[PDB]
Structures are given as structure tokens and as C-alpha cells.
Amino acid sequence: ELSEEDKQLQDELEMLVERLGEKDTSLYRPALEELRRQIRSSTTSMTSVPKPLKFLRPHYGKLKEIYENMAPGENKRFAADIISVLAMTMSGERECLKYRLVGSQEELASWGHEYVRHLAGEVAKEWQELDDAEKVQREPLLTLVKEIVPYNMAHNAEHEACDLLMEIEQVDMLEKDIDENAYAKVCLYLTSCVNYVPEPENSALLRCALGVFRKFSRFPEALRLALMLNDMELVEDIFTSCKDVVVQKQMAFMLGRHGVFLELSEDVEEYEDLTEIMSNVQLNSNFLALARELDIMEPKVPDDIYKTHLENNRFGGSGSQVDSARMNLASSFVNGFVNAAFGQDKLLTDDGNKWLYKNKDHGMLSAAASLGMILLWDVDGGLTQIDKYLYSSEDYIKSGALLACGIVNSGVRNECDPALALLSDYVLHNSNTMRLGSIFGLGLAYAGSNREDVLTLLLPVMGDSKSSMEVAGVTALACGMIAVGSCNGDVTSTILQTIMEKSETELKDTYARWLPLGLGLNHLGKGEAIEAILAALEVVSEPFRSFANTLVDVCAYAGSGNVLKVQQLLHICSEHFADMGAHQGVAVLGIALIAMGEEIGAEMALRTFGHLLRYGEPTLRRAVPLALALISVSNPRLNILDTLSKFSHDADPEVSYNSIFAMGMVGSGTNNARLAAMLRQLAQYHAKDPNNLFMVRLAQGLTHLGKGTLTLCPYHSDRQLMSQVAVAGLLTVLVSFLDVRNIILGKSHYVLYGLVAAMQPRMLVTFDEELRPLPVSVRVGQAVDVVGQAGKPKTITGFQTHTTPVLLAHGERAELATEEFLPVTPILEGFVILRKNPNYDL
Amino acid sequence: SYDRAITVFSPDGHLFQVEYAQEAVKKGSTAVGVRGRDIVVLGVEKKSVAKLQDERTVRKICALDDNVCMAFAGLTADARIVINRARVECQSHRLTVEDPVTVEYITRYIASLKQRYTQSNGRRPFGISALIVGFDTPRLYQTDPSGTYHAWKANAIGRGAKSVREFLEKNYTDEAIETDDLTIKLVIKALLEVVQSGGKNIELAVMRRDQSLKILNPEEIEKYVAEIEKEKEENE
Amino acid sequence: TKGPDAASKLPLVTPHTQCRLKLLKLERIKDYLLMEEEFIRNQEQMKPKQEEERSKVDDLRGTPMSVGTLEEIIDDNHAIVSTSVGSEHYVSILSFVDKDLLEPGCSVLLNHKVHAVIGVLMDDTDPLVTVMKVEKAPQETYADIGGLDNQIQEIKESVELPLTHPEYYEEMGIKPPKGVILYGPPGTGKTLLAKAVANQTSATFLRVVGSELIQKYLGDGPKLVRELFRVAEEHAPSIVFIDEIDAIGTKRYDSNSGGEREIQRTMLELLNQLDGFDSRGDVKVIMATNRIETLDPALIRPGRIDRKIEFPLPDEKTKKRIFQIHTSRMTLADDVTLDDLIMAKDDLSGADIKAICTEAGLMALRERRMKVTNEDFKKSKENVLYKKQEGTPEGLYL
Amino acid sequence: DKPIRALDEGDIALLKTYGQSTYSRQIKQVEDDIQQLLKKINELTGIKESDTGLAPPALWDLAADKQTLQSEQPLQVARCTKIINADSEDPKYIINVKQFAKFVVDLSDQVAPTDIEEGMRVGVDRNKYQIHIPLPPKIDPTVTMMQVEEKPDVTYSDVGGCKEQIEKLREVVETPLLHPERFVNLGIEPPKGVLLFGPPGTGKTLCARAVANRTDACFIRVIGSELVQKYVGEGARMVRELFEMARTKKACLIFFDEIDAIGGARFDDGAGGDNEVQRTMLELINQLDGFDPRGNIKVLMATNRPDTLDPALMRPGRLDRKIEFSLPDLEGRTHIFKIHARSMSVERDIRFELLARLCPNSTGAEIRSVCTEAGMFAIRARRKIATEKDFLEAVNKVIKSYAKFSATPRYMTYN
Amino acid sequence: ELFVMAREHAPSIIFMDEIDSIGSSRLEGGSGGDSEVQRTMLELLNQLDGFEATKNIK
């Protein structure tokens, strides 16, 4: 019950509210003045219970009607203020809003923080309740926001300000209202909220954050959000606005990492240095330094990688003297991938022709591509060795050499463009293998280029009726992955015409799946323009109509997180009815690629995939491991590996094959000794089937990629920056792997080399302002945010001290433990430039 | 099972009662001491006394003789007994031989007296460790409840021993003891590294060459603390 | 093989602030859960073979199925099986049974009427052991532990790093530590660290009290310990947490005490499981005890327990970290200076800091305040901290 | 002081409303329905079908299983206690049905009277209890699982510093077996039992593992948890059947690991004590030595607390030789360091004599822990070679960090 | 079993009167120690605060 002070205050409140019965002149001003005074005193204090509000439980009906009849001036406004404060505690949402709306304006700050928050919530509720039928109510709510937002800004309440500004769908005022000490908080809030908000508000929020960062001149972050938006005009605007040459070099490094090559005018000083950095010619050299820091110059051999000295030699000296072709292809992939990018191998460099001569047709192409893939990012160094094998006796393997070129020029660009020159006279080659090699090399060398000359040169291949189905598919995929995430009308129209003119009998083959691929590869991350795409694709008949629609639906929403598209895809998967299950497989890959945008969505996609596996039909069971591989590329999560190990022994050969490839992709480059042991056990168990052995050895090569210093992650910048080229590469490999026997185990091993398009390295090489390497002590650990929305860089814990260059595993980041240097980019990934601290004093 | 007598060796040759005697020192307030070219300084963590308690009787810096003083850490009564015995022995040495007692000799006597209480059963070892500073040449020695003495350029015993010594080794430089004020400031900083009250719980005694003791009043110590704070204010 | 049964956990939703970002992440979780529900509801709804297989096998075996113990395998289809009543029967082994699974002492499903071997029971796990397995991972994570960097690093190198990165251990040649005892004063973070590692680990986790592994009947104690460790072996990557090992880890000594000798037999079986004849495999053991000096040396010796992680009373930096973590969900005022609580020598542990925060919240609620102040924390310090009586000697030492 | 006022319902409503409620209600409801949804999924799947012995369809494919079920009949196992032999024409047979009862039955016409000898176990029909089939003699399952049948990979070169212990062990468990002629010529009966005792981790179980590794005879690793049975006298019967199985094998080896479990001291002042465990220990005592000579059964026993053993068991007629494992000397500790650092990726300049001298009173297990900790230190800072400083830090972390409280100021007492 | 019943009937309040009997200061080994009472002590201590967090139990 009450107290003496409480009872006296209750009596005073009751007297003040009861005096309003009649219309005496000295009632409305005195009583409302007293109520205003008490309410303001209680509300403008600590969060203590508002004692006047607790005591006040009257009815305002008489108060509302008298409001209607008495004092059209300020007294009704005082009454409105009082009833608004009273109804903030009660449930009078619309009335409580309109009391502040039409009553005494004064200011929302004069009431209290809680009153401001409640008014903000009610304003958001009304705005969501108000449609475009009338804009009369919108303007006063906007005026309320005009004062609500600065209140939150000045009282560290940026949460409510940002939320309200997202409800009203208007975010322009953040440009003119954000302070120096609060830009990071709101910017991080937006860059985290963009992933979960659906279309089209995510793009508006992204451009709002872009404008904020431009206003505060945080140019690297502006570049990050510009690549998030995937629009070149604002990237060019940021490039022009960058007046600091060190920031220019940093943004060139990040552009090269993302693979975005924008033409630079000669008006910008130091054009040559920026161009050569963006071409990423230096990377290999740094990689070499990397390797000579870890004493891993010496390349490995497949015999030691398989560890034959440990396998139980049940048949000794009688069952291993025969060298089958398929195991030779697997050993080529191993003695490639494992030793790749180190500039040397002990079996393909000194005994090349002898090795290649024990391969047949497809083995020739695979080994020729692996010869270039054993030396990465050295265009001249790679081609100096590739030319002789291009001059080979078996001119059919010439195409393979082109792959080598295309696999050597990957991740780099030259002014003279050796790849374009070398393949310009070979693209029009009538031989199917020659044209295939030419187009594949051109695509791999020019991933993400979007250069009009190469696209125009690739156009006539689609209209060539002579060109075979697999030539058409490889051409379509190369065109798509040269024009990743651009919605190029030229390529879209060309592929649409090619598929429209294609016959059903010729469409029934597996390679026709690669026709939507490039089309889909033209529309990565842009789901707005795909209504016309689906309308155009609706002309073709089912089932391939549904197949193409599903594939373009995946490609449109790559990482979008649109749960409605995932619901449609899950409905497709759950429909229990050969080619009919292709739709379900593509939809499963769609759930994977949409959910990999967000960590939460991905981890729930894990549970959905488990449910699909334990309760799905054979086609879904085959499809899921590819999805699991897509979800966690180069992220050896133990639960995923355990599920894949459980299903590697399944009685369905396709399911086991897909599970093995999922081991290879998920644990790629992590050098996981547990994964290596499990793969050795799988090789021992599957020692009889050539296909299982081939794919398990491929998985071992993938997991020993670069001796553990290479990753296939399509994500960068704390996994927030997507990579269109890498996403394209994994998409091609996975959709080809939807049919392992006909494509992977058939005539199309070269498709595996598309993963090298996604081949991106991990280091911590630190450069000075002049780009010389600089050893800096670095604190490396997990980025587990021990705070909420404090704006912290996840507050790296699990500390370990390192000297650069350093190797960072997936999910573990780094920070500068020394204040002597300041990084231009606060995200310590890849090559960075540290400016000497001017604030530090000796 | 081998720690209930002073004359029993442990199976690994440990005199456990002697080792236990050092915990009494470990329970005492920190006493720091350094030697300079012309001065020997020694500060003491002077823990706050009760409101009604007279602090005159609570003395940790005691002068064994006009040329040598001593600050203990450990049991107070054992410290009183040891200090009285040291004074008597120094006077007796001055009586037998004309020249005054050297700080090394008085430290040797104190160490031998402490040892002779650890050799016999039915005689509790002294639970104090002492810092003895004097001129003969400025010399600083430290005793031990075990009965071992050592010569130091700088110690600190008592509650803060590892921390204050850790501060001391990378602070005792040639220029640090170049000036008498510099040496006293070094002692003040070393004591402030442990005594986290400032001024009110710091008592420093300085003995200059061929001079007498001078307990620093809580205004000169306040001035030195202010100077140290001003010097450390260069961080900003 | 029977790979690990890792506990399931929902993704962490951060920030923990009551903002729209938390709403969006939680609604994404709800979306995906509803997707799973829709799929799992329409799966069996659209299900239109093996039914003949079931109608034959189940009819042949019939219900109920008795559970007996295999004793002898006489022929390829005849076995001497002992029923639970201890009566042996020479019964037949039906065709639909894997002859390689039958081993002496195995649990075998028999027909109710003719007791013929109709199948083999695989698990036959003691209910007191299957309850030790953790199904719901605890919510406490490594981000909820203030300070304790050395202890967390040691425990990660022991039980976490070998699972994720065995490459280092295999390359250098070390066998990773397979036993850790978390010892220290109570309320320092031992059980909290066990909760955190259980949350983080991808391996199966078994939680034991060090006293539920003790049974009434004479031989069921060591048998239960053996069953628990065998279950840990089954799910190969395993972590066996035995809180309060003091209950059984006490030092061996000679007395009549007919129950104490069984106590010592149980602890002897435990140490045999830890390191005795035959290898232990890839199962780690985490042990916690307030008093370690009272433990038997043969239990905490290296090889059985490789690491002894000390949990001291938190220092100033650690205490400040605890206060920052445990008031993160609070709404602190501007007049609050947590430092005064962190300083002084109250010898307050992490649990003490948690209680201080809770009591400060209660003090604020007493004044009808949802935001705490410095005065509330000061009152809570004296209100809660009154734990020890004297713990100190008199003014002997100067 | 001012008493705390109660919290009225209006106050509760205000505190739970006058604050964050824009998203608090929605967040809480979403969390609650998330928990309910998780419960729904778990319930709706909720099977995890238990594995049962269902063979592959091609394995059985037998419609005659029902014919076997109905035609063949179950038989209860019972040992023929006695042959009555009334007139050698209606002989009668007294059988004992385990615990059910005892009966006087006759054989079925299928079997011959000469094929059913006294004392063997036979199958009887459940209705007329008539003998139907002779059975092989009972072999306890757990007793046959007590055998090792899988030699561990611990050789004798992995036990350093115990040369005398190894030689005395091989003198009792290996030499009298491989070359018995070296003893009968001198008329010496070699000891038939060895008690391995010493500090924990000194290498008793390691030496037992080596013995089992190169035994070449029947090795039985007795489990101390199985001699301890729920029912009265079952542990004694366990010992009897174990010794009988050992006697069936030619010159078997038995290793009672951790003998303190069932080798306590007999007593009666405790008003009952164990009794059953004491009875099992007494039967083991009887089997070891006494009437009914044990035979060629050399017995291995290990315990790192031997003072609690029964003096009857400790008597040198059951455990004749008492091999003691002591803390290794400097040379032995160097040997252990070299053994345990053999496979490590360490430097070639490591002075292992220094490390051995730095661990005065340390068992071999502590040396192994020191090596592992040196590797861990070399891993923490990611060096691929473990240097001498890493080993010194490991020695400090393992030995000195937990040895005693003799701090450096207290360690200044020695020079 | 007491704590499992309290959880199954949650919310619940457990009143443990005269906790000196089981609850007193823990002893070392040796024949003097009660041991089993300390075992019940440790089980109760973990039950009310251990690896598994009690909900709505006071």
C-alpha cells in the first residue's frame, strides 16, 4: 500500500483532477499547470516509477469532451500533453500519438527519454499503418522525427533513431545529422542490418551508409559498401574523390582482391602504380616470400600425401604395378593443387612429357591445365614453360596448354594481354577440343573483366550451329563468368536466343544445364531484373522451363537471404513426384547459396540439410552434399565433416561421391590432419572402386591445396564482401557435379579447374607506404564480439602474437598490437599498408 | 611430516621450519631500500594506524648506530629484539676496537644471531628480514630468517617483494642514483608501485655520507610525490 | 564407428540490446524454423515395398521381445542365451540376424515364446550413463568469461585445438593433453569454463557429478564408470567432465569402512580408465575440484591428468572484466564508478561479482529504479560480501 | 534505517512498462515461440530409430525361418548331476537346471546313454525335461574377454631407467618360459609371481604392456571391476573360472592390474566390512598357492600402493618376487627423455642431461608430460622446431610450478 | 531425485533445515572424515549450482 508522502501526493492529484468538474476561470490554468509541473518533474528524472502516473487512474472521457469544448487556445494543449503522458503508460496508441501531434508542441525533450522512445514506437506503428492513400498525416510525423532523431543522436540512442528512420523508409537525415563520434556505430548497424532486411530497403540503406561514409571521408569503407551495392559509377566517384595516394594504393589492393578492374584515366597521378597493383602482378612474388617464410618451398609428391607407408598393404608387390588412367588423373590433380602457386614441382617440371604420355585424351587436357596450375600468378614465368607443351606432338593437347595460360593469367592482368592474343586466333578453331580449350582459357584468364571486345568475340560461338553441345555449354559459362553480376543485355539476349533456337532433343543432354548457367552467371546478386528473365524463360516448355527458372532464381538471389525465395525452393524440394529431380537438386543448391549470405541463415540451412538428408528421396540425398560444400567452403566445421563422413559410406554411389567432394571443398586448404586421416581411411575402404578412389584423392588434393595456404572462400572483408568470380566458379563446379558420372567422371574433368578461378590466397604481408614489406607484431585471434552493438571490431580474443607475414585460418582475424603504425584499412586482410604513426613520441 | 621441527632434514634436504619462517616476512609491509653515490635511502610502507593510535611507537626504520640504520619486515617483537641486540653488539664492537662498526660487520652479526636460533630445537627462528644500510662507501645488505645475508644495490622486502623488485631492476640505473634527489625520487616511485595510497603511507629515511639520519617529514615527501607526478604527467 | 553426438545449439543472436537488429536476427531464426516445420510436416503427408519386409520380419519375431545375455555360440544358428532371470536356454538364431554382431556377453533380442534369437540389441546403455550425455549445449560461451586468458588458452590447447587443428600436434610429434583438472577456490570459473567449452566444442560432452557415478550395489560403481567410459569411446571425439572429483578422488588410505573400500575401488576403476592397460583413445577428461591437495596422487599424476589449471581469485584487471561482462545487460548510470568496487582487497571472486551485480539490481528495484547507481553497488558490496569471519591474524607483523 | 517498502501491483506494471517496450514484447514473444518451434521439430522427428540386428535382405531371404521357429523347440541348459543307473536299462539321470530346480529325467531316443556322461551340460525340453543334446563345457564370456588377444605396441625399448626391473621381470615371466632348461639344470624353481610396486607413473603398467607385447603365451589382463560382482560368491566363482581357463592354456600369464582393488587387508572389527571382496581375495590366495598346486601360471600383479595388501597375499609363496620401481636416476631420466623426445620435432642441441638433472624427483610420466609441454610451448608461438628454451619452460611449468612453495627468496637459503 | 522432482514440479522451493549435519566444513581424507556426507554435499552443491542451471528453483 501507499505511504504518508504517497497518500498526500495521491490526495493532491485527486483534488487537482476533481477540480476540473466545472468551468471556473481559475481552474484550467491552475490545475493543468500543476499537473504539467508534477508530470514534468517526475518524468524528467531517473527511471523511478512515475508516481503521478501510478496515482492517476481516472477517465479522460470527460477530459476529452471538455478538451473539445473549452479554450481553443493553449489550455486544450496542456490537457493534450497531460493525457499523452498518462496514455503512454496505458494503451492509447493512436490517441497518445495524436495528443502530441495536435496538442502543445513545446518539445519531446522536455518530457523524458522514455516518452521519446514511446512516441517513436507509436510513430513507427502509425507509419506502418499508413499507406500511400494520404500524405496529410505523414508530414507532422516527419516533423516529430525531425526532433526525435537529434535527441537519440545526442543521448547515444542511435538504436531507436536508426530503427525509426528505417520504419519511415526515409534515411536522408542521417547524412546531415550524424556526428564524428557516432558515425562508426550507425554505419556498423546498417552494414549488419542490410543482410537481413529484404528488398528493396537493403539497397537504400546501403547507399545511405555509402553517403555517410563519403561525408566522413572513410574511403576504404565507402569502397566496401560500393562493391556491396555492385555499381561501378559510385566506385568511380570514390576513386576520383580519393585525394590521399596511400588510400588510393589501399583501395587498389582491395579492388585487386575483389577482382574489380576499372579503367583509370591519365588525369590521376601515379596511374601506372595503381594499375600494376590492381593487376595484382606483385601477389605471386609476395606469395613466394610467404612460402620462404614458412620453409615450404619444397613441393610435395602424391605418394607422401596419400601416405602409402601407412596404408595396410594387403596385396604386396602384385596389385599396385598397374597404373590406371583415372588414378593418374587424380595424382595429376594432387601433384598440382597441393604444390600449386609455389613456382616448382619435382615431377611435372623435370619429367613433364614422360608424365603426360601416360594419359589419354582427357588426361592430356587435365595434365596440361595442371601444368599451368602448378605455377600461379606468373604470366611470363608460366607461359615460358607452357609454350613448349603448346608446341606438343599431340596437337589435340594444345587446347590444354591454353587452359594453362587461362589458369596462369587467373588473378592477374598484363598490359599486352598474352591470353587475349594467344586465344584470338584459336577461338574460331573448328576442332571441338581446340575451341573448348580456347574459350575456357579466355574465360579463366578474364574472370570478372566484362570487357566488350572479348564478349563480342565470344558472341559468334553461340550462333554457330556447328559448335557442339559441350562447346556451347563451356562458351556460355565462360561468357557468364566474364560478365559476372552485370546483367549484360548483350549476353542475356544472346543466350536467350541460343536456348530458344535449341531443340528439345538437343536440350535433353546434361551440357544444356550450362546454358542457363551463363545467363544466371550474368545476374548474380541482382534479383530485381529477373522478372523479365523468368517471363522470357517461361516460353520454353517444362521440365527444363522449371529447371532454368530455378537456376536463375538461385543466381538472382546469391547471398540475398530472401526467405520467400528459399520457401519457394523448399516447396520445390518437398514435392515428391530423373530430370524431374534436377529441379529439386537446383533448389537445394539454391537454399545453400541464398543462406550462405548470413551466418545465422547458413547454420539453420545446416539443420534443414540434415532434415532433407534423413527424410528425402534419392535425388535430394545426392543434391544436399553439394549444398553443404557450398555453405562452408574452406571452413572445416567439424559437424559438417562428421555428417559428410557418415554419408561417405552410403550405399548410393552418387551420394558418396557428392559427400567426398563436399569433404574436398569444405576442408579445402585447411590442411586438417583429422580430415586427412578420414580421407586416407576412405581411400583404404574404397580401394576397389576407381571412381571413389579418384574423388577421395581429389578431396585430399583439395584439402592439401597450397600446403594449407590457399582457400576457395568466395567471401572477403570479415566474410562480408562477396566475390562474384569465386561464386561463379563454385556454381559452375557444383552444377557440373550434379551429374558426377557424365561430366566429372566423363569427359569434363577440366571443369574442376574452374575452382582455380576462385583460388584466392591468405596471408598477412604488411607493406610500408612505398610498398616494401614491413614486419609488424600482430595480435591474432577469434573475432567473437564480447559486446552488443558497441561498434567494436568484434573485440578479438584468444590472442596469439605473430610476426608478419602470418597465416589466418577461416574464422580467425588479426589486429595491430603496436600503436607505432596505423593501417589505412582497419580490416587486416591480405596485403595492407601501414602509415607510420605521427602521434607516437619516442 | 618433516615440518614440525627445525633440526630435521626433509627427504629432499629441506629445513622446512626455516622456510616457514620467511612467510612471516612475506606477511609484513613492504620496505624498500637503495644506495646512491653519496646517500643511502630506504622507504617504508607506513600502513595507516587507527584513529586513536599513537604512531610514535610504530617504528620500522631503526638506526643501529650513527653510521648505520635498519628497516625490517616481519614480526614486530622479533624485530625489536634483533634491533636491540644489533645496537648492543655495535656498541660492544666500538668498545673493543676503536673504529666504528662496519655495515658488513653488523649484518654479519645479525645473520649469525638469526642462524644460531635456527640450529637448535626449542628455539623459534626470528621471523624478520632486515635491510641494513650504512657508510664505512655506501653499502646495503639484506638478512634472512634463515640466517643468510647478501649485498644489494637495491631491495624491497615484505608484502610487495616480487613486484617492487621487478620495478626496481629496470629502474636502478647509474643516472638514477646520480643525484640524491633522484635516488629519493626513485625510492618514492618504487614504494608507490605497491603502496597504493600515496604520501600518507610512505616513510622514507635518508642517510647521507658522514651525516646523520633524517626521517622525511610528510611535507618533503609530499613535495617529492608532487614532483614525481609532474614528471609522469609527460604521458599526455 | 558411431561418430560423435554433438549437442545442438541455435546461432547466437547479437547484439543483446533490445533493438531492431536483434528482432531481425530472431525473426530469421523463426523463419528458418518455420521452413523446417513446413517441410517436415508436408514430407510424410505426401508419402504414397519394404512394408512386406517389415510385415515378415516383425511377424516372425513377434512382440514383446525379451532381452537376454548371449553366453555361447554353439552353431551358426544356435546359441546358449541367459535370460534376465539367470536361466540359460539353448535357443536358435533366426536368419535375419547379423552373425558378426553376435559376441559373448552381448544383449540379444529373443522371441517371447520360444526365446529364439530374433535380433541383437545394440545400445543397451545404462540410463544413469545416457543421462550424462549433453543434449542442449549451455548458453555460456567464451565471451562470457572475463580474464582467465591463460586458463582458457590451456583448456583450448588441451581439449579444443586438437579437434580443430591436429596438424600442429601431428607435425611436431606431441600427443595432445588428454586430461585437465580445473582446481582453485570456489566461484572462480571452473564450472563456467566447462560450460563454455561444452558450448564451443563440436564433440560429444558427458557431464558427471563425481557422485552420480557411485551406486548402491557392491559392484555397480566401477561397472558404471566402465560403462560411462565405454560410451565415451563409442562416440570417438568425446569430452568427459567430472565436476567435484573430490567426491571420489580423495586420497587412498587403509580402514575397514566397507563402503569406503568400494569408494576406492570405484576411483581405482576410474584411474584405470584414464591410464591403465589398453589405450584410452580420443576421449578427453576435464575434472574440477575446490580442494586438490586432498586428491590421490595416482589420480592427478601426469599421463592420467596431463594439466593442472589453477583458478586464482581474480585480480584487478580480471575483476574489472567480470564487472564489465556482468553489467553488460544492465543500464548503468553516469555517476557509477565501478573502479571503487574493483579496487580494495575484499578477495571477491567472479561469483561474488555476479552476486554484487544482482544485489545492486535489487537495490535499484527497492528504490523503484530500473537503472543502477554507484550507491546501490556500494550497498550491495557490504550486503553480499559478508562471507568470511576473520581469515586474518592480528597486528603482529609490521 | 528506512525500511524497504513493498512493491505494489501498480509499481510492478510501471516498472515492466515504463521503459523499453518498442521491441521488448516482440523479442520476448519471438524467443518463446522459437523455443516452442524447436520443441515441435524435435517432437515431430523424435525417432532416432535404434539399431537392431536386422541383416541385409539378401542375407536371410528365408521364409523357412518360421519353419525353424515352429519345428525346432527351445532347450533349457542343465548339467547332469548324477547317473542313477537303476538297472542299466532304466538308468534315470539327475540334472540341475541352473537355479530352477533339480530333476530325475531320461534321455530322448535321439541321444545315446554312452554319449551322456555324468557332470556335463545338456539341453532339456521344457515340458518333460528330457535330455535332448550334449553341450560343450561352459566358458564364461567375461572371462574370455579378460584375455588380451591383441598385443599392445609398447616394446621393451620404451621403458627407460628400469633396467634392473625389466631384467628381474623377464627372469620370472619370459626366461622360465622360452628357456626352461637354464633352471632345471640348476634345480631352481623360478618364482611364479611378481608384484610391481612403486610411485604412480613409474612404469609398472608400461612394463606389463611390454610383457603382453612379447609374451608369446596366453596373457590375461584381469579387470578389477569384474571380480567385484553384485551377488554373493560370484567374484570367487569368477576367480575359479579364470584360473581354470588359465590352466587350460599351456603356461598362461595373468596380470592383476591394480591389485589394491581386490587385495585389501582382511578385518572383522568393522562389523562386516567388504566380506565378499575379502572372500574373492581369499579364493585368489587359495588359487595362487596351497593345496591343488597352481601349475605353470606365472602371475603378474601391479599396484602403486602396496602397503594396504593382505600379508597373506604379500607372502612370497603367491607373490614370490617383489620388483620395486623407483624414481629414475640421472642416467635413467636422460634415457626416458631421449625415449619420449625421439618422435618430436626438436633441435639437435638439446642437452637432455640438463633436463634430467632439472627434474630430481620425477617419474617417467612427468618426463613425458615435460616433453609434451615443450612441444606445446613450441606450438603456441608457431615454431616448427622445439628448442632448448621450450624444454626449460616446460620443466618449470610441470615440475617447479607444482613441486612446492619454496620460492626463490626461500630458495636463497642454498647456494 | 529431490531436485528432479522439484524441476518436474517447477516452480519450487526447497527448505533444508539444520544444514550443519550435511553442509558442515569439508574434511580431508583419513578415517576421521565422514566422506559420504561430503559426497552428498558435493552432489547437492552441483545440483543447485553446477553444469546444469536450475530454472525457477529456489
Ligand SMILES: Nc1ncnc2c1ncn2[C@@H]1O[C@H](COP(=O)(O)OP(=O)(O)OP(=O)(O)O)[C@@H](O)[C@H]1O
Ligand atoms: N572469470 C569469470 N568470468 C565471468 N563470470 C565468472 C567468472 N568466474 C565466475 N563467474 C560467474 O560465477 C558463476 C559461478 O561460478 P562457477 O560455476 O564457474 O564456479 P566454480 O569456479 O566452478 O566453483 P565451485 O568450486 O563451486 O565448483 C558463473 O556462472 C559465472 O557467471
Ligand SMILES: Nc1ncnc2c1ncn2[C@@H]1O[C@H](COP(=O)(O)OP(=O)(O)OP(=O)(O)O)[C@@H](O)[C@H]1O
Ligand atoms: N621408464 C619409463 N620410460 C618411459 N615412459 C615411462 C617410464 N615410466 C613411466 N612412463 C610413462 O608413464 C605413463 C604412465 O605410467 P603407468 O601407467 O605405468 O603408471 P603406474 O605407475 O602403473 O600407476 P598406477 O598407480 O595408476 O597403477 C606411461 O604411459 C609411460 O609413458
Ligand SMILES: [Mg+2]
Ligand atoms: Mg563450480
Ligand SMILES: [Mg+2]
Ligand atoms: Mg599404472
